[PDB]
mmCIF file of C-alpha atoms and ligand atoms in Angstrom:
data_model
loop_
_atom_site.group_PDB
_atom_site.id
_atom_site.type_symbol
_atom_site.label_atom_id
_atom_site.label_comp_id
_atom_site.label_asym_id
_atom_site.label_seq_id
_atom_site.Cartn_x
_atom_site.Cartn_y
_atom_site.Cartn_z
ATOM 1 C CA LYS A 1 4.598 -20.224 20.533
ATOM 2 C CA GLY A 2 4.145 -17.979 18.025
ATOM 3 C CA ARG A 3 1.071 -15.782 18.660
ATOM 4 C CA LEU A 4 3.011 -12.237 18.313
ATOM 5 C CA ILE A 5 5.777 -11.935 15.177
ATOM 6 C CA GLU A 6 7.587 -8.931 14.093
ATOM 7 C CA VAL A 7 6.543 -8.238 10.470
ATOM 8 C CA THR A 8 8.591 -6.774 8.011
ATOM 9 C CA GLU A 9 7.468 -4.771 5.205
ATOM 10 C CA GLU A 10 8.014 -7.811 2.469
ATOM 11 C CA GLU A 11 5.898 -10.136 4.839
ATOM 12 C CA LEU A 12 2.931 -7.472 4.982
ATOM 13 C CA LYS A 13 2.660 -6.684 1.349
ATOM 14 C CA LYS A 14 2.141 -10.804 1.335
ATOM 15 C CA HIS A 15 -1.074 -10.453 2.710
ATOM 16 C CA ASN A 16 -3.208 -7.963 0.306
ATOM 17 C CA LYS A 17 -5.228 -10.455 -0.634
ATOM 18 C CA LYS A 18 -9.124 -10.197 0.997
ATOM 19 C CA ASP A 19 -8.696 -13.856 2.313
ATOM 20 C CA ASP A 20 -5.725 -13.311 3.621
ATOM 21 C CA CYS A 21 -5.772 -9.366 4.647
ATOM 22 C CA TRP A 22 -3.049 -7.943 6.757
ATOM 23 C CA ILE A 23 -3.242 -3.915 7.666
ATOM 24 C CA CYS A 24 -0.666 -1.976 9.820
ATOM 25 C CA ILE A 25 -3.000 0.711 12.310
ATOM 26 C CA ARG A 26 0.342 3.129 13.978
ATOM 27 C CA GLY A 27 3.099 -0.302 13.746
ATOM 28 C CA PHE A 28 -0.004 -3.298 14.850
ATOM 29 C CA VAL A 29 -0.378 -5.627 12.346
ATOM 30 C CA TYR A 30 -3.766 -7.167 12.118
ATOM 31 C CA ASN A 31 -5.360 -9.900 10.755
ATOM 32 C CA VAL A 32 -8.556 -7.902 8.980
ATOM 33 C CA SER A 33 -10.076 -10.685 6.803
ATOM 34 C CA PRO A 34 -11.634 -12.127 9.807
ATOM 35 C CA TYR A 35 -13.563 -8.494 10.193
ATOM 36 C CA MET A 36 -13.962 -8.095 6.160
ATOM 37 C CA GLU A 37 -17.537 -8.900 6.370
ATOM 38 C CA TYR A 38 -18.239 -6.839 9.591
ATOM 39 C CA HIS A 39 -16.347 -3.078 8.672
ATOM 40 C CA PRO A 40 -19.243 -0.112 8.348
ATOM 41 C CA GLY A 41 -17.274 1.086 5.373
ATOM 42 C CA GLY A 42 -17.525 -1.795 3.885
ATOM 43 C CA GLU A 43 -14.908 -4.530 2.005
ATOM 44 C CA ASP A 44 -13.796 -2.345 -0.522
ATOM 45 C CA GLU A 45 -13.191 0.658 1.515
ATOM 46 C CA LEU A 46 -11.289 -1.494 4.157
ATOM 47 C CA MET A 47 -9.129 -3.060 1.031
ATOM 48 C CA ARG A 48 -7.724 0.109 -0.110
ATOM 49 C CA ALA A 49 -4.936 -0.695 3.131
ATOM 50 C CA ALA A 50 -4.573 -4.247 2.022
ATOM 51 C CA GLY A 51 -1.086 -5.647 2.884
ATOM 52 C CA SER A 52 -0.547 -1.810 3.614
ATOM 53 C CA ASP A 53 0.167 0.615 6.522
ATOM 54 C CA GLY A 54 -3.359 1.356 6.541
ATOM 55 C CA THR A 55 -3.063 4.422 9.407
ATOM 56 C CA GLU A 56 -3.361 7.409 7.121
ATOM 57 C CA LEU A 57 -5.932 5.618 5.340
ATOM 58 C CA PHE A 58 -7.342 5.145 8.984
ATOM 59 C CA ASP A 59 -7.068 8.564 9.965
ATOM 60 C CA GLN A 60 -8.829 10.225 7.387
ATOM 61 C CA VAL A 61 -12.011 8.353 7.898
ATOM 62 C CA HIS A 62 -12.213 7.618 11.910
ATOM 63 C CA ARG A 63 -8.922 8.747 13.557
ATOM 64 C CA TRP A 64 -10.663 7.730 16.951
ATOM 65 C CA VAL A 65 -12.297 4.460 16.425
ATOM 66 C CA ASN A 66 -11.086 1.961 19.033
ATOM 67 C CA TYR A 67 -9.170 -0.654 16.462
ATOM 68 C CA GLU A 68 -6.614 -1.919 19.456
ATOM 69 C CA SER A 69 -10.063 -3.551 21.074
ATOM 70 C CA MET A 70 -11.933 -4.245 18.301
ATOM 71 C CA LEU A 71 -9.293 -6.121 16.356
ATOM 72 C CA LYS A 72 -7.145 -7.516 19.887
ATOM 73 C CA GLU A 73 -8.042 -10.990 18.878
ATOM 74 C CA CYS A 74 -6.344 -10.641 15.438
ATOM 75 C CA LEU A 75 -3.186 -9.161 16.082
ATOM 76 C CA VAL A 76 -0.335 -10.520 14.288
ATOM 77 C CA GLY A 77 2.528 -7.949 16.171
ATOM 78 C CA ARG A 78 3.999 -5.806 15.164
ATOM 79 C CA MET A 79 6.127 -4.334 11.968
ATOM 80 C CA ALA A 80 9.971 -4.264 12.461
ATOM 81 C CA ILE A 81 12.026 -1.326 13.124
ATOM 82 C CA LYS A 82 15.363 -0.206 11.401
ATOM 83 C CA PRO A 83 18.033 0.242 14.218
ATOM 84 C CA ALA A 84 18.686 3.478 13.797
ATOM 85 C CA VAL A 85 15.100 3.981 14.753
ATOM 86 C CA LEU A 86 16.470 3.590 18.027
ATOM 87 C CA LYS A 87 19.103 6.352 18.141
ATOM 88 C CA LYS B 1 -1.390 -0.173 -30.050
ATOM 89 C CA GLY B 2 -1.726 -1.442 -26.388
ATOM 90 C CA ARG B 3 0.155 1.351 -25.134
ATOM 91 C CA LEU B 4 -1.997 2.593 -22.730
ATOM 92 C CA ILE B 5 -4.265 -0.190 -20.216
ATOM 93 C CA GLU B 6 -7.121 0.089 -17.234
ATOM 94 C CA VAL B 7 -5.443 -1.285 -14.895
ATOM 95 C CA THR B 8 -7.142 -3.432 -12.144
ATOM 96 C CA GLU B 9 -5.953 -4.220 -8.552
ATOM 97 C CA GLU B 10 -6.383 -7.321 -9.720
ATOM 98 C CA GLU B 11 -3.469 -7.000 -12.533
ATOM 99 C CA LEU B 12 -1.945 -4.326 -10.352
ATOM 100 C CA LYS B 13 -0.460 -6.650 -7.627
ATOM 101 C CA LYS B 14 0.501 -9.845 -9.627
ATOM 102 C CA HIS B 15 3.079 -7.398 -10.957
ATOM 103 C CA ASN B 16 5.326 -7.302 -7.743
ATOM 104 C CA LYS B 17 8.583 -8.639 -7.982
ATOM 105 C CA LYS B 18 11.622 -6.731 -9.084
ATOM 106 C CA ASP B 19 12.434 -7.729 -13.070
ATOM 107 C CA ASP B 20 8.324 -7.546 -13.657
ATOM 108 C CA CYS B 21 7.525 -4.033 -10.630
ATOM 109 C CA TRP B 22 4.252 -2.154 -11.562
ATOM 110 C CA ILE B 23 3.564 0.600 -9.019
ATOM 111 C CA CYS B 24 0.502 2.832 -8.724
ATOM 112 C CA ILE B 25 1.105 7.089 -8.139
ATOM 113 C CA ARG B 26 -1.580 9.194 -8.083
ATOM 114 C CA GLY B 27 -3.847 6.726 -10.069
ATOM 115 C CA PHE B 28 -1.107 6.508 -12.918
ATOM 116 C CA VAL B 29 0.269 3.257 -13.049
ATOM 117 C CA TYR B 30 4.085 2.291 -13.895
ATOM 118 C CA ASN B 31 5.995 -0.600 -15.001
ATOM 119 C CA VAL B 32 9.385 0.383 -12.476
ATOM 120 C CA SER B 33 11.493 -2.402 -13.506
ATOM 121 C CA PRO B 34 13.714 -0.494 -16.010
ATOM 122 C CA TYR B 35 14.375 2.226 -13.303
ATOM 123 C CA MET B 36 15.206 0.059 -10.360
ATOM 124 C CA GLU B 37 19.188 0.028 -11.158
ATOM 125 C CA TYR B 38 18.900 3.965 -10.971
ATOM 126 C CA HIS B 39 16.506 4.984 -7.973
ATOM 127 C CA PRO B 40 18.596 6.984 -5.869
ATOM 128 C CA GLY B 41 17.324 5.769 -2.926
ATOM 129 C CA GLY B 42 18.213 2.161 -4.300
ATOM 130 C CA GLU B 43 16.472 -1.237 -4.689
ATOM 131 C CA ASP B 44 14.785 -2.254 -1.768
ATOM 132 C CA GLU B 45 12.923 1.222 -1.616
ATOM 133 C CA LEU B 46 11.316 0.850 -4.345
ATOM 134 C CA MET B 47 10.164 -2.634 -3.953
ATOM 135 C CA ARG B 48 8.455 -0.958 -0.586
ATOM 136 C CA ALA B 49 6.299 0.164 -2.742
ATOM 137 C CA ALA B 50 5.782 -2.830 -6.039
ATOM 138 C CA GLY B 51 2.441 -4.384 -7.243
ATOM 139 C CA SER B 52 0.802 -1.351 -5.012
ATOM 140 C CA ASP B 53 -0.021 1.743 -4.755
ATOM 141 C CA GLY B 54 2.853 3.832 -3.886
ATOM 142 C CA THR B 55 1.171 7.171 -3.493
ATOM 143 C CA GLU B 56 1.604 7.209 0.180
ATOM 144 C CA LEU B 57 5.491 5.873 0.793
ATOM 145 C CA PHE B 58 5.819 8.440 -2.461
ATOM 146 C CA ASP B 59 4.806 11.392 -0.585
ATOM 147 C CA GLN B 60 6.199 10.481 2.788
ATOM 148 C CA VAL B 61 9.754 10.729 0.750
ATOM 149 C CA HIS B 62 9.701 12.821 -1.941
ATOM 150 C CA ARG B 63 6.472 14.691 -2.657
ATOM 151 C CA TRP B 64 7.714 16.777 -5.570
ATOM 152 C CA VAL B 65 9.750 14.593 -7.682
ATOM 153 C CA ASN B 66 8.943 14.715 -10.997
ATOM 154 C CA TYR B 67 8.162 10.972 -11.891
ATOM 155 C CA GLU B 68 5.210 11.534 -14.962
ATOM 156 C CA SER B 69 8.345 13.234 -16.653
ATOM 157 C CA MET B 70 10.959 10.836 -15.333
ATOM 158 C CA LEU B 71 8.700 7.543 -15.891
ATOM 159 C CA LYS B 72 7.077 8.630 -19.268
ATOM 160 C CA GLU B 73 8.488 5.815 -21.318
ATOM 161 C CA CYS B 74 7.411 3.096 -18.260
ATOM 162 C CA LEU B 75 3.924 4.775 -18.451
ATOM 163 C CA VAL B 76 1.369 1.123 -18.084
ATOM 164 C CA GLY B 77 -2.410 3.244 -17.493
ATOM 165 C CA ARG B 78 -4.418 4.355 -15.110
ATOM 166 C CA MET B 79 -6.131 2.476 -12.169
ATOM 167 C CA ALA B 80 -9.711 1.638 -12.958
ATOM 168 C CA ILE B 81 -13.077 3.450 -10.934
ATOM 169 C CA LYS B 82 -15.863 2.367 -10.241
ATOM 170 C CA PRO B 83 -18.839 4.266 -11.978
ATOM 171 C CA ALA B 84 -19.709 5.823 -8.733
ATOM 172 C CA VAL B 85 -16.352 7.223 -8.429
ATOM 173 C CA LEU B 86 -18.088 9.663 -11.953
ATOM 174 C CA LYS B 87 -21.254 11.143 -9.600
HETATM 175 C C1 HEM C 101 -7.876 1.545 6.886
HETATM 176 C C2 HEM C 101 -8.559 1.573 5.665
HETATM 177 C C3 HEM C 101 -9.533 1.838 6.108
HETATM 178 C C4 HEM C 101 -11.029 2.319 5.594
HETATM 179 C C5 HEM C 101 -10.490 3.096 4.316
HETATM 180 C C6 HEM C 101 -12.079 2.614 6.239
HETATM 181 C C7 HEM C 101 -13.341 3.597 5.704
HETATM 182 C C8 HEM C 101 -14.283 3.516 6.128
HETATM 183 C C9 HEM C 101 -15.063 4.095 6.185
HETATM 184 C C10 HEM C 101 -15.737 5.381 4.838
HETATM 185 C C11 HEM C 101 -16.993 4.464 7.126
HETATM 186 C C12 HEM C 101 -17.633 4.574 6.824
HETATM 187 C C13 HEM C 101 -17.597 6.841 7.555
HETATM 188 C C14 HEM C 101 -18.411 7.063 7.464
HETATM 189 O O1 HEM C 101 -19.502 7.031 6.111
HETATM 190 O O2 HEM C 101 -18.426 8.623 7.453
HETATM 191 C C15 HEM C 101 -16.069 3.766 7.872
HETATM 192 C C16 HEM C 101 -16.618 3.289 9.138
HETATM 193 C C17 HEM C 101 -16.049 2.696 10.185
HETATM 194 N N1 HEM C 101 -14.734 1.684 10.083
HETATM 195 FE FE1 HEM C 101 -13.515 1.795 8.570
HETATM 196 N N2 HEM C 101 -11.868 2.204 6.865
HETATM 197 C C18 HEM C 101 -10.916 1.821 7.420
HETATM 198 C C19 HEM C 101 -10.354 0.591 8.225
HETATM 199 C C20 HEM C 101 -11.474 0.652 9.926
HETATM 200 C C21 HEM C 101 -10.803 -0.239 10.508
HETATM 201 C C22 HEM C 101 -9.486 -1.175 10.837
HETATM 202 C C23 HEM C 101 -11.557 -0.111 11.380
HETATM 203 C C24 HEM C 101 -12.039 -1.534 12.862
HETATM 204 C C25 HEM C 101 -10.764 -2.126 13.529
HETATM 205 C C26 HEM C 101 -12.828 0.436 11.443
HETATM 206 C C27 HEM C 101 -13.460 0.512 11.353
HETATM 207 C C28 HEM C 101 -15.152 1.421 11.491
HETATM 208 C C29 HEM C 101 -15.864 1.433 12.715
HETATM 209 C C30 HEM C 101 -15.908 0.956 13.686
HETATM 210 C C31 HEM C 101 -16.993 2.681 11.413
HETATM 211 C C32 HEM C 101 -17.891 3.420 12.005
HETATM 212 C C33 HEM C 101 -17.301 4.700 12.956
HETATM 213 C C34 HEM C 101 -18.915 5.208 13.761
HETATM 214 O O3 HEM C 101 -19.874 4.335 14.148
HETATM 215 O O4 HEM C 101 -18.896 6.273 12.954
HETATM 216 N N3 HEM C 101 -12.492 0.992 9.828
HETATM 217 N N4 HEM C 101 -14.827 3.202 7.634
HETATM 218 C C1 HEM C 102 8.321 5.092 -8.330
HETATM 219 C C2 HEM C 102 8.830 6.801 -8.796
HETATM 220 C C3 HEM C 102 9.614 7.001 -7.857
HETATM 221 C C4 HEM C 102 10.702 7.819 -8.306
HETATM 222 C C5 HEM C 102 11.039 8.402 -10.082
HETATM 223 C C6 HEM C 102 12.230 8.315 -7.310
HETATM 224 C C7 HEM C 102 12.966 9.380 -7.466
HETATM 225 C C8 HEM C 102 13.618 9.836 -6.499
HETATM 226 C C9 HEM C 102 14.533 10.783 -6.996
HETATM 227 C C10 HEM C 102 14.994 11.940 -7.404
HETATM 228 C C11 HEM C 102 15.079 10.420 -5.821
HETATM 229 C C12 HEM C 102 16.121 12.006 -5.124
HETATM 230 C C13 HEM C 102 15.961 13.005 -4.748
HETATM 231 C C14 HEM C 102 16.811 14.172 -4.283
HETATM 232 O O1 HEM C 102 17.405 14.141 -5.310
HETATM 233 O O2 HEM C 102 16.782 14.625 -3.160
HETATM 234 C C15 HEM C 102 14.894 9.432 -5.055
HETATM 235 C C16 HEM C 102 15.217 8.803 -3.542
HETATM 236 C C17 HEM C 102 14.625 8.444 -2.440
HETATM 237 N N1 HEM C 102 13.552 7.828 -2.871
HETATM 238 FE FE1 HEM C 102 12.903 7.441 -4.551
HETATM 239 N N2 HEM C 102 11.870 7.362 -6.293
HETATM 240 C C18 HEM C 102 10.284 6.769 -6.850
HETATM 241 C C19 HEM C 102 9.715 6.270 -5.539
HETATM 242 C C20 HEM C 102 9.984 6.467 -4.154
HETATM 243 C C21 HEM C 102 9.533 4.927 -3.321
HETATM 244 C C22 HEM C 102 7.934 4.417 -3.517
HETATM 245 C C23 HEM C 102 10.139 5.400 -2.477
HETATM 246 C C24 HEM C 102 9.750 4.742 -0.923
HETATM 247 C C25 HEM C 102 8.814 3.233 -0.762
HETATM 248 C C26 HEM C 102 11.426 5.964 -2.490
HETATM 249 C C27 HEM C 102 12.193 6.228 -1.676
HETATM 250 C C28 HEM C 102 13.078 7.141 -1.664
HETATM 251 C C29 HEM C 102 14.121 7.168 -0.640
HETATM 252 C C30 HEM C 102 14.003 6.896 0.739
HETATM 253 C C31 HEM C 102 14.967 8.402 -1.202
HETATM 254 C C32 HEM C 102 16.112 8.852 -0.355
HETATM 255 C C33 HEM C 102 15.644 10.344 0.535
HETATM 256 C C34 HEM C 102 16.517 10.577 1.287
HETATM 257 O O3 HEM C 102 17.198 10.302 1.406
HETATM 258 O O4 HEM C 102 15.926 11.504 1.731
HETATM 259 N N3 HEM C 102 11.759 6.514 -3.694
HETATM 260 N N4 HEM C 102 13.277 8.817 -5.712
#
């Protein structure tokens, strides 16, 4: 139970510390704390997106990196949507 | 004295509550708590950037709003930089 969740922005922003770092990329939310020590660009760079939507930063440095496959085991879930999104 | 300070990432993240809400826009840090009740987009929207760098969110909704003049009385200071930034 509880493998994949809906993530509100309020929830996402709680996870803004190195040891508890969530980032949203294209609506998918990942727990990148276990990846911190491996990121080729270093920890400080990854932390620029801590607790936030990292899509723009990600796209400005390496748009084609296969994050979905690399981070699959760290997938938290998906960002919540406003009902109007579905109009 | 003490009107403008250097703001670290650690310090910025502490000011994440509605009554003590700091937002960084383009390196400038503002305590927006007094502005909460006036923001045309409402309080929830402004809270999306609480205790964080709000530049991307700000630019996604109203790039041209004159925040420097509007929020001048709320200016905390500037984000810290690493020495390497000055190379
Ligand atoms: C969202 C904030 C991120 C920032 C600011 C960032 C920044 C960087 C930077 C500066 C580099 C070195 C690029 C260069 O010197 O050309 C890099 C490399 C790399 N990063 Fe990130 N990164 C972010 C997120 C991620 C994430 C989430 C992943 C993994 C899913 C990732 C995987 C990689 C990979 C695979 C490389 C090496 C690409 C190559 O071999 O050329 N990055 N990153
Ligand atoms: C922190 C400094 C900010 C200032 C000084 C500011 C100022 C303003 C102003 C002047 C408007 C009305 C613009 C108009 O007349 O067309 C507005 C609306 C709005 N604001 Fe902000 N804002 C700030 C931050 C933010 C942030 C960070 C967000 C998003 C997280 C946001 C979300 C919105 C939204 C959604 C609207 C209504 C936009 C629309 O319906 O087109 N604001 N704000």
